[PDB]
Design a protein around this ligand. Structure first.
Ligand SMILES: CCCc1cc(C(=O)[C@H]2C=CN([C@@H]3O[C@H](COP(=O)(O)OP(=O)(O)OC[C@H]4O[C@@H](n5cnc6c(N)ncnc65)[C@H](O)[C@@H]4O)[C@@H](O)[C@H]3O)C=C2C(N)=O)ccn1
Ligand SMILES: CCCc1cc(C(=O)[C@H]2C=CN([C@@H]3O[C@H](COP(=O)(O)OP(=O)(O)OC[C@H]4O[C@@H](n5cnc6c(N)ncnc65)[C@H](O)[C@@H]4O)[C@@H](O)[C@H]3O)C=C2C(N)=O)ccn1
Ligand SMILES: CCCc1cc(C(=O)[C@H]2C=CN([C@@H]3O[C@H](COP(=O)(O)OP(=O)(O)OC[C@H]4O[C@@H](n5cnc6c(N)ncnc65)[C@H](O)[C@@H]4O)[C@@H](O)[C@H]3O)C=C2C(N)=O)ccn1
Ligand SMILES: CCCc1cc(C(=O)[C@H]2C=CN([C@@H]3O[C@H](COP(=O)(O)OP(=O)(O)OC[C@H]4O[C@@H](n5cnc6c(N)ncnc65)[C@H](O)[C@@H]4O)[C@@H](O)[C@H]3O)C=C2C(N)=O)ccn1
Lengths: 268, 268, 268, 268
C-alpha cells in the first residue's frame, strides 16, 4: 500500500533486535518492500532475530572483508530475488572499530592494523558493497549508508570518528559511480542510539571514563535537539532511511541527511 | 492518498505557472493535501494561475512586508480551513532582491535600502511566516523554505546570495521556536530552475549577452550533478519539499536538504 | 623592527580599552604599523582611550550608516597619511544589534527595522568600508573583519548570529572585488571576549536568562578548546588579525581564520 | 630573524627540489629557523637535494610505516639538536596513494591493501609523528600537515581525496593530545602545485591525453581564486606553513588554513 511498494531492497547490518538495521528492515517491510538480508558471522543469531520481522526475507552471508563473499554477492542476491529481477535499494548499516580504537585506549595507542580493519569495515566496504550491487540495481535506485557527524572531534569515539570522515568522502565518490546507473548514494547521520554495544559501552565496557563521556554526549544531544532526541528509539532513523529509499528524494546524492533531532544545527 | 493525505498545507509564492511554488502545490495536491495558497500583489494574475492546479484552494493575500497582513494571517487561514482545524505544513517559497543587488550592478553599487528590502522579503519573512502560523500548526507539522547554496560566492547572484546565507541562519533559529510546538523547520536548497524569475534575472542581466549563459548554467550543472539535473523540470524539487512536509523525515530540523542533483557535493 | 613594519593600516571599532580593536591597534603598533583610527559617535571617549596606545595615530570620524562619512573617507584618510601614500590594511571591528534582537526578547519579536539596522552596521558595512578604501589600498593589501562562528544557532545572540552569517557571505563577495586590487579580504572568528558590553550582558543587562546562557557558553568554550580559551584576554585575537595583515598569509582570501582556542573543531 | 628566529623545527617530506616540503624548509631557514630534516628511502638522493638549501641541517631517516623508525625518532632528533633542547615545530609534508587509487583505475578497482597503505602514509602517520615528537616539543609549539580540500569529490584524486578526509579528522584528534603540551596542530590546505608528484600523478594518468590537463588545472584555479594562483610557485604555501609555525596564530588549533588563493570560497 505504501512508501516502498514493490521495491526490492537489500539490508545489511542486522545483528540483534536493537541494531538500527533491524528497524530499517521492519519499517521497510511495513512500507511494502521485499527484502533480502545480509549478515556477517553469527548467522544463527541473525536467523532467529530476522525471523521476528513482519515478513520472511532470505538471509545471505556477507563478510565485507571477504573478497569471495563480495565476488558472489550479486549472483546470490539474484538467486534470492529471481533472475531477471534487480534491486531498487541497498542499505549499508555496518561499522566496527577494534577496542584499541575507541574508548579509554589513548588515541595515539591504536595500532594501524586495528585502525585499518576498522576503516576496511566501516568505510571502504561502502564502496565494495556499491561495486558488487550496482550491476544489479534498477535506475531510480538508492544506496544508503549509516553515518554519524564526524565534522568535529570528541572523546571516546576516536578512530571510529576518523572512519566516519572517510566514509563521508567515499559516499561522494560512490555517488559519481552510482549516478551512471541512475542510482543515488547518500548517508543518514543518526543521533546516538542505544544498541547492545552502545549500552555496554555506556556501562563502561571500554573503560568508565569513556562510558561517562558518552553518557554526557547523549544527555547534551537531547538538550540541543530542537525537537528532542530519544536514544532508545531507532524508528525516526529507520523512517529517514526509507525516505531516501523512496522516490521522494530523487534529486539528492553524494549527500548526508541528518536524522538527529536537529542537534548538529545548534551550538547549545 | 499518495504522501500528504489528510494534510493541510499553506503554500506561499505562486506568481507564474513557472514558479517553484506552483509545482510544489501541484505535486502536493496530487499526493492528497488540502492547500491554502498565499499571494502578492497581482492577486488577479495569480488567481487565474491558481485555477490551473489539480483541485480548488482558498487564495489569500500576503504581503510579507505588511505587518498587518501577517497579524491577520492565522485569522484568515483558520476562517478558510475551518475553525478547530490547524495547518500541518507551511511552504515559504518567496524571494526578492532589487536588480541593483543582482547581476546588473557591481556588488558594491547596491544601496542598502535595496539590500535591506531584499533581506526583509527573502530571509526575515521566513521567521515572520513562522511567527504568524506556528500558533495554528499541529504537532508533527513541518515548515519548509526554498534556498540555494550560498556557502561559496559566485557571479551575479550577489546580494541575493547574502540573503540566502541570512535565510539559512534564520532557519536554525526558527527551528528552536518551532520545536516547542513539535514542529520541524527546514530548507530545500534547489539546483537552478528555469523559472521566469531566473530567466530574466540572469541571463538578463548580466549580461545582455545571453540566454545562452542560462543554457550554459543548465549544461554545467547537469555535468556537476552525479545523477544529472534538468533545469526545465522542478518536479524533483517539489517532491523533495513534499518529503519534508511528510512524516518520513521526523528527526530532521534546522537543516538543509539539497535537491540539486548532488552538484554541491562535487568540486567538478 | 617587526611583523607589520612600514604598513599603514586603518583600524575601526575602538570604543573602550576593552574593545577588541583597541588590542588589534596596540599589537599592530608594537609590530611597527602606522595607524589611522576610525571612531563612531563618542569621539571624546575614543580620543582619550586612543591616547593610551603605544603611539599617537590620527582619529577620524566614521558612522558606517552615514553615506557622507563613507563618501569622504578616502580623502580624509589620504589627508591623514599624506597624499601619494596608500593603506596596506583595513580592520573592520564593528558590530551592533538593537536590544530587541539579542538576549531575552523573543527571536520572533525583533522588528525588522531593528534587525535591518543591525545588519546595516554588522554586515553591509563591511562591503561599504571595502568600497570606500580599496581605491586607496596597495597591492598585497589586507582587509580583515571580526566574526563569530554562526554556522549553528544558539541562545541569546539571536539576530546578531544572523548578521554574522550575512557578514561571512559578504566577505566572500568582497574578496572578489578586493582581488582585482591584489587585496585580500578575510574574517577572524574570535572566541567570546569580555568587552564592556559582554560583561554587562553576562551581568544580566539583556535579561538574566540571557546572562546565564552566555555564562554557560563561555564556560563550555574554554572546556572544548584543546588549548583553552581566556575570555579576558583579547591578545591572541589581536595577534591573529595582525597575521592576516602581514604578508605571511598571502594566499588566503574570502576565508575565515578561527582565533577561538580550537573550540569550533570539538563537539565536547 | 625574519619570523621563525630561534625556533627549532622538524620538516619531513623532501623527495625532490620541487617538493612542497623543500620550499617550506627553504622559507623557514630564510626566516631564522634551525631545521632537522626527515627522509624516505632515497636518503642519498634527498641528501644531494637537501644541500641546495640555504643552511645546513641534520638529515634523518623516517619510514613512517616503520614503527621502529618512529620509536627512535625523538631519540635521534634530540641527539641531533642537542640534549636539553626541544622542537618548536613539526611539519608533516607526506603523502602517498598507489596509482590504483588515483586517476588511472576506476575508483572501485582499487584493492583495499593499496588504499590501506595510502591511508597509513597519508593520514595515520600524522598521529604517529605527533605521538613520537610531542614529548620533545616546547609549549607554544606547532604541528602542521599538508592537506588539500576533500569536502567535495572530483576526478582522479579518488582514494587520495578519501585519505585527506581522514587526515582532517585525524588532525582534530591530534589537537586534543597536542593541547596537553601547550602545542597547536593544524593543516594547510594548499591549492594545486606543480610538484613532480603532481605532474605525473595526473595528468599522467589519467589520462594519457595531457599535461595539457595539468595546465588546465592551473588556468581554472587562477580564475576561481579571487587573488589568483600560480601553480608553479609554492612560496605562498610555504609562507602560510611558516605563519602557523610562528606565534602569530596562537589561538588556532584542530583547524585548516586554506592557502589556495581563496578558490575554495567561490563556486566559480
Ligand atoms: C555522540 C557523538 C558521536 C555520535 C555517534 C553516533 C552513533 O555512533 C550512531 C550513528 C551511526 N551508527 C551507525 O549505524 C551502523 C549500524 O550500527 P548499529 O546498528 O549502531 O550497531 P550494531 O547493531 O552493532 O550493528 C553493527 C553491524 O555491523 C556488522 N559488521 C561488523 N563487521 C562486519 C563485516 N566484517 N561484514 C559485514 N557486517 C559487519 C555487524 O554484524 C552488525 O550487524 C554503523 O555504521 C554505525 O556506525 C550507529 C549509531 C549508534 N548510536 O549505535 C551518532 C551521533 N553522534
Ligand atoms: C547558479 C548558481 C546560483 C544558485 C541559484 C539557484 C536558484 O536561484 C534556485 C534556488 C532557490 N529558488 C528559490 O525558490 C523561491 C521561489 O523562486 P522562483 O519560483 O524561481 O521565483 P518566483 O516564481 O518569482 O517566486 C518568488 C515569489 O516570491 C513572491 N513575492 C516577492 N516579493 C513579494 C512580497 N513583497 N509579497 C508577497 N509576495 C511577493 C513573488 O510574488 C513570487 O511569488 C525563492 O526563495 C527562490 O530564491 C529558486 C531558484 C531558481 N533557479 O528559480 C539554485 C542553485 N544555485
Ligand atoms: C558564544 C557563541 C557565539 C559567540 C559570540 C562571540 C563574540 O560575540 C565575539 C566574536 C566577534 N566579535 C566581534 O568583534 C567586533 C568588535 O566588537 P567588540 O570589540 O567585541 O565590542 P565593542 O568594543 O563594543 O566594539 C563595537 C564597536 O562597534 C562600533 N559601532 C557600533 N555602531 C557603529 C556605526 N554606526 N559606525 C561605526 N562603528 C560602529 C562601536 O563604536 C564600537 O567601537 C564586532 O564585529 C563583534 O561582533 C566580538 C566578540 C565578543 N565576545 O565581544 C565569539 C564566539 N562565539
Ligand atoms: C585539483 C583538485 C585536487 C586538489 C589537490 C591539491 C594538491 O594535491 C596539493 C595539496 C596538498 N599537497 C600535499 O603536500 C604534501 C607533499 O606533497 P608534494 O610535495 O606535492 O609531493 P612529494 O614531493 O612527492 O612529497 C611527498 C613526500 O611524502 C614522502 N613519502 C611517501 N611515502 C614514504 C614513506 N613510506 N617514507 C617516508 N617518506 C615517504 C615522500 O618521500 C615525499 O617526500 C602531501 O601531503 C600532499 O598530498 C600537495 C599538493 C600538490 N598540488 O602537489 C590541492 C588542491 N586540490
Amino acid at each position: 500500500a505504501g512508501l516502498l511498494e514493490g521495491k526490492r531492497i537489500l539490508v545489511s547490518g542486522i545483528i540483534t533486535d536493537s541494531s538500527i538495521a533491524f528497524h530499517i528492515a521492519k519499517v521497510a517491510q511495513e512500507a511494502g518492500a521485499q527484502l533480502v538480508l545480509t549478515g556477517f558471522d553469527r548467522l544463527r543469531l541473525i536467523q532467529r532475530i530476522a525471523d521476528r520481522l513482519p515478513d520472511k526475507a532470505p538471509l545471505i552471508e556477507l563478510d565485507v572483508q571477504n573478497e569471495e563473499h563480495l565476488a558472489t554477492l550479486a549472483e546470490r542476491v539474484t538467486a534470492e530475488i529471481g533472475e531477471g529481477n534487480k534491486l531498487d535499494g541497498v542499505v549499508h548499516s555496518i561499522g566496527f572499530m577494534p577496542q584499541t580504537g575507541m574508548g579509554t585506549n589513548q588515541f595515539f595507542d591504536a595500532p594501524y592494523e586495528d585502525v585499518s580493519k576498522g576503516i576496511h569495515i566501516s568505510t571502504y566496504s561502502y564502496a565494495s558493497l556499491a561495486k558488487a550491487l550496482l550491476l544489479i540495481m534498477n535506475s531510480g535506485g538508492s544506496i544508503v549508508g549509516m553515518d554519524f557527524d564526524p565534522t568535529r572531534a570528541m572523546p571516546a569515539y576516536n578512530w571510529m570518528t576518523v572512519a566516519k570522515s572517510a566514509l563521508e568522502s567515499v559516499n561522494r565518490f560512490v555517488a559519481r559511480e552510482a549516478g551512471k546507473y541512475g542510482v543515488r548514494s547518500n548517508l543518514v547521520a543518526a543521533g546516538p542510539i542505544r544498541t547492545l554495544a552502545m549500552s555496554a559501552i555506556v556501562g563502561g565496557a571500554f573503560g568508565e571514563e569513556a562510558g561517562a563521556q558518552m553518557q554526557l554526549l547523549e544527555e547534551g544531544w537531547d538538550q540541543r535537539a530542537p525537537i528532542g532526541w530519544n536514544m532508545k528509539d531507532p524508528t525516526p532513523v529507520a523512517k529517514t532511511v526509507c525516505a531516501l529509499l523512496s522516490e521522494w528524494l530523487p534529486a539528492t546524492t553524494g549527500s548526508i541527511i541528518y536524522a538527529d533531532g536537529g542537534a548538529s544545527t545548534q551550538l547549545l
